Symmetry: D2
Subunit: 339 residues, 4 copies
């Protein structure tokens, strides 16, 4: 089985947030004590897992909801900077095993662009990972989406640095939580709510022309694309045969399949299904699919024993396991990168 | 090609609602004049389409948002009764070509159960079709969901009559529309918002124990299951391996795959994709998949030329085209029912 | 996991043929001593495997090449009678776990029909399993095929008794072996030669009208159909669009898809691929697919751990695992038959 | 819709072989007069079809059985030289639309190697296309296979020139025809016999170590791989878990999946099935699949309207339609090569 795999939806948390970490674990972990140790650890447990399961390189990112949960913009910016400085220091212990995505406050486009630039230019971070919309407003009940002209300066910064942006989910909050989710709360997270948020935001970027103004922008979705490949036919039909005759073409110049060929990537995080992977290879193409785990919400063992033992042609196993990410992130050599 | 097909997501509108019909058409039709004529027509244009394309029998239902848009419970109930009386007269003209689903006000469980009972016992309707949540509250900004114990009397009526309930989508309205959809409005409807509503409601029924209290209950989703089959693996994993260790097992006794084998059906309405159909046959099983069109939002030609010519084994073409629905709806003979 | 599974490509050998068993094992086993014990054991080792792996019922058959390797018709007939008497006594130990297929000499249609009748009427055997063509001629270099009018009396007996016929492979021999296989001998058996023989014979039955004269006849192929589902499109095209315009229609009245819907079954024996299973469900239909193992050439563990853990909807897992065979073979209760 | 497609299983015949052409047409064409005109035409009808259906570039090859039907080696060699000189002259008329594969007598490895070299060095031919084994012996009843060390000089010539070898089928002849096919003659050709021959030959090359001695060698199969992808799991299992423990590893050093990633290509010729293409994308990988037609045995319309309209992600449509072939055959510029 395959050595030198790359995973890039792999979360950490600051040690000082044990209470928040235990809260998130109460929703999404069956072993909270192990979860606290694993999500705070960078350089021991994570390496032991990766050595056992053929993972050469991991791009680390901050746990959800992370900075997007913080609606005080001053507090949010300070936390992002703290997190980026912290993980940059941590990955220096084992730089041949780890990279990092930038953690950002997304209250303000220029501020986020400047901090992403700092992360990339100063620390060699590989892109940004953001947990869907930024909570905003007096009690955090507002949502900042990034699919509009105010964010052009930010998306042009991604394309100038040529680094991708990973749109990770976050939990529903406030008014949205109360109206839709509170009475069916077991659906919060991976079962449904996570994908509803991310697919809304990315298809918002599609239909509001973000990839037309920034066609080099690379956007990554985890969880095999948050339902979007299932409706590729249906979205394409209702765009090209319906809404684009009614006004959508004014802000959306290409097909949904064009944007998946040129701009959008999907990851295998938390979706260890060969049948669904095969369907995504049909609807999206193996060139656009990246291995990932969703650790420590998922185990290395679940993800890697699935992928290593999945029935897959050798060409696509290599691409999805590491070679797609090697090219996308312009990776230097790392442990087992050519094994 | 295949004769005697059954379609059952096929909408009509009352002639007296032309203004509302034209509004809905301005969002979802590219030929509004034909749409207006086709959605009100039952027994001429609709028959001509079905004769050209091998559709023997259609179960008709009221257009979306229909009665679920009406937040005055007295007006809503009167409209539902009016619609059911109206369509019973229309389908009496060609009983070998048409059946009907009940149209319901869902403000009150017992009231809805009594009108469903009247439709089945008086008119021989085949079940109910409801456009997601019932608008309620002073300005219609509240939502009535049916995934709780207050609706036990209604679901027990469905199982006592042994008729299915079709959970059809409706548009986002009010605060939900303003917060999530207004800034990305081209995603309203088939592109995304429709599936988000229906999947939320049906998975709410799953996780709140509706199919445990009412194990005979049959629920149908259009559009190949509103994303749910894509995440069957992911939902199953996050139910059985995560949330069911945290409390979900107290209100959810079977697996998501169990509920799709025993309670839930999907339809091909508006999703004319053989690649996606094949994937749904893996994840749901051809026994649980029904042909449908979504007329007049989709054309007979699009739906029927796809299905009649799709590469499919002969066994499943027959089941999905008509034999599954013949059994589910206990259909007597109809035009070309054994052709 | 699933209990009460049925397997029906499960071989035994007579104890007195140890030399032949060891020769066949030298080609197709990596542990010949265990293979010899397992292929000769009926009522102990097989039960231990079946108890561990959720197999309720096994229909046993004689090992390849079996009687089809015997070109002396007197010797062949006596061996078939001997084998059938033997296994009837053996399966008698555990009728709640075992049935049997008839073993036949196929030198003479009437003789084969009479022995099949004896097996069904005297012993309650479930059908016939035959290893492709019957060796005949001076050195056994001739081949007897069954896709012609001389065999009408035999196929009419199958439909009168209403039992299926399993077309199992055998090794290439004589002139064919020397010319095609000796210089690439590692392809003999499962890698290639087995499927070439069975597909030739069954498609011979198709194109020579066997299923037109005997429309109730049920034919089973192992190994997910011996390549035939892969070319369902290509065969259908070259039948309906080419050869049926050149003369094939005179002896072949239905499409290849008709014959797979009405006459032909495939088995999962020795082909534990969910990806290939999904493709066969598209091309053949889950109603026409039966679980089987190919023991002791395959292990219970490989077949059952694959099938029990494969990603599959619950409807088709139940059908393929046991319910298709329960109906096809008109099975009374057996261990875990309704578990 | 897609322009600039490349097809490379596209046959021509010499005008002086009209009688042979009409015999072959009597087996495989329903319109012999059009077939005769189309198979002999190079620069008018073939261009008109390609202009209508978005085919920018075609690599032409000699009809089957071609030179492999000629068992006199002097006559065979003279015919190969004649064919290669002829087509080189014909394709100079439209060099932006046509290339050619070498036609070879395969009686002698050095002779075939020298004529292949002449074709590539003198005429810029793109590789070789050979119709399975070379008929040999006094009345042509012997078969020359190429999967042995005597052919090392030929395969080394292929890798030194860095051009692929297309293993095309031919009809069964002589004793093999009489014993296997004469009594089920409608299966000769595309329905079954063609794939049996090619898969035997290519898997012979695999198991006799040709790709271990010549790891750069590229071998192409038409018709979506002549059944081999269907059994990728089964072949791999019976190699790695069985025959490679018995001696096969001594002459076969990699897995069947390795050889499909490094040495073997498949084509869509005569197999216009999206369901089967998707399955082949899973089992072989879209990087290893090339569009082709099988003209004039198949029509441009069937092949191109299937492919142009098949549900496919944009990445793989571009690769399979032309970009895979552009890279493999180093086709920098031709008509619509960048449309
Ligand atoms: Mg995550
Ligand atoms: Mg509808
Ligand atoms: Mg067997
Ligand atoms: Mg050809």
């Amino acid at each position: 089985h395959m050595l030198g795999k790359i995973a890039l939806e792999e979360a950490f948390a600051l040690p000082r947030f044990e209470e928040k970490t235990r809260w998130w674990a109460s929703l999404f972990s069956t072993d909270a004590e192990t979860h606290v140790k694993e999500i705070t650890d960078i350089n021991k447990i994570r390496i032991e897992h990766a050595d056992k399961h053929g993972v050469g390189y991991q791009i680390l990112s901050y746990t959800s909801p992370g900075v997007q949960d913080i609606w005080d913009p001053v507090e949010a910016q300070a936390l992002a900077v703290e997190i980026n400085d912290y993980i940059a220091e941590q990955v220096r212990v084992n730089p041949d095993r780890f990279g990092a995505f930038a953690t950002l406050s997304m209250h303000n486009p220029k501020e986020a662009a400047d901090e992403l630039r700092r992360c990339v230019e100063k620390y060699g971070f590989k892109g940004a990972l953001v947990n869907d919309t930024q909570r905003a407003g007096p009690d955090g009940d507002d949502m900042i989406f990034y699919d509009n002209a105010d964010w052009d300066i930010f998306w042009q910064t991604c394309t100038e640095l040529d680094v991708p942006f990973y749109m990770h989910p976050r939990n529903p909050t406030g008014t949205i939580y109360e109206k839709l989710w509170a009475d069916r709360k077991w659906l919060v997270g991976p079962p449904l709510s996570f994908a509803h948020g991310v697919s809304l935001h990315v298809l918002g970027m599609v239909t509001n022309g973000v990839f037309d103004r920034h066609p080099k922008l690379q956007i990554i979705m985890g969880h095999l694309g948050e339902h979007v490949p299932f409706d590729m036919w249906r979205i394409n039909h209702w765009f090209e045969d319906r809404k684009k005759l009614l006004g959508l073409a004014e802000t959306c110049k290409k097909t949904i399949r064009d944007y998946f060929a040129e701009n959008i990537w999907i990851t295998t995080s938390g979706h260890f299904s060969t049948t669904t992977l095969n369907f995504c290879m049909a609807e999206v193409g193996s060139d656009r699919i990246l291995f990932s785990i969703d650790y420590p919400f998922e185990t290395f063992s679940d993800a890697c024993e699935w992928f290593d033992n999945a029935e897959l042609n050798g060409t696509d196993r290599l691409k999805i396991g590491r070679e797609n990410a090697k090219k996308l992130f312009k990776l230097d050599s790392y442990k087992d990168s050519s094994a």
